[PDB]
Design a protein around this ligand. Structure first.
Ligand SMILES: *[C@@H]1O[C@H](CO)[C@@H](O)[C@H](O)[C@H]1NC(C)=O
Length: 111
């Protein structure tokens, strides 16, 4: 059951949607906001605030903020597939001072 530090787990049935919460600090409010998916030593872009999106998620992923809450962004992923399962990282900013949040998506799929 090893996880990255302070991981938020989301559990969804196949074909449903998930809204991932990505907290950050004021220092990174002006910076790029992104979600990426872990591979063992790579994190592959899912979507970022420059409107770049992974072809495997286009039409299914949306990145937004809400109200005047200046300290959190959201990524909704719809039409979940078993291949969407796994670890993701939220990032606000770039480099050593970036705010990161570890996320684990569990997708329950047919036997
Ligand atoms: C997304 O899932 C929520 C449950 O968290 C549900 O209320 C909502 O209707 C779903 N939206 C779509 C477009 O499937």
């Amino acid at each position: 059951g090893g996880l990255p530090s302070d991981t938020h787990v989301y559990t969804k049935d196949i074909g449903r949607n998930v809204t991932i919460e990505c907290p950050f600090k004021r220092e990174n409010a002006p910076s790029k906001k992104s979600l990426c998916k872990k591979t063992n030593q790579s994190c592959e872009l899912v979507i970022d605030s420059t409107e770049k999106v992974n072809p495997s998620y286009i039409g299914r992923a949306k990145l937004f903020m809400k109200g005047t809450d200046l300290t959190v962004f959201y990524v909704n992923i719809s039409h979940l597939t078993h291949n969407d399962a796994g670890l993701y990282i939220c990032q606000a900013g770039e480099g050593p001072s970036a705010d990161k949040k570890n996320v684990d998506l569990q997708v329950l799929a047919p036997e």
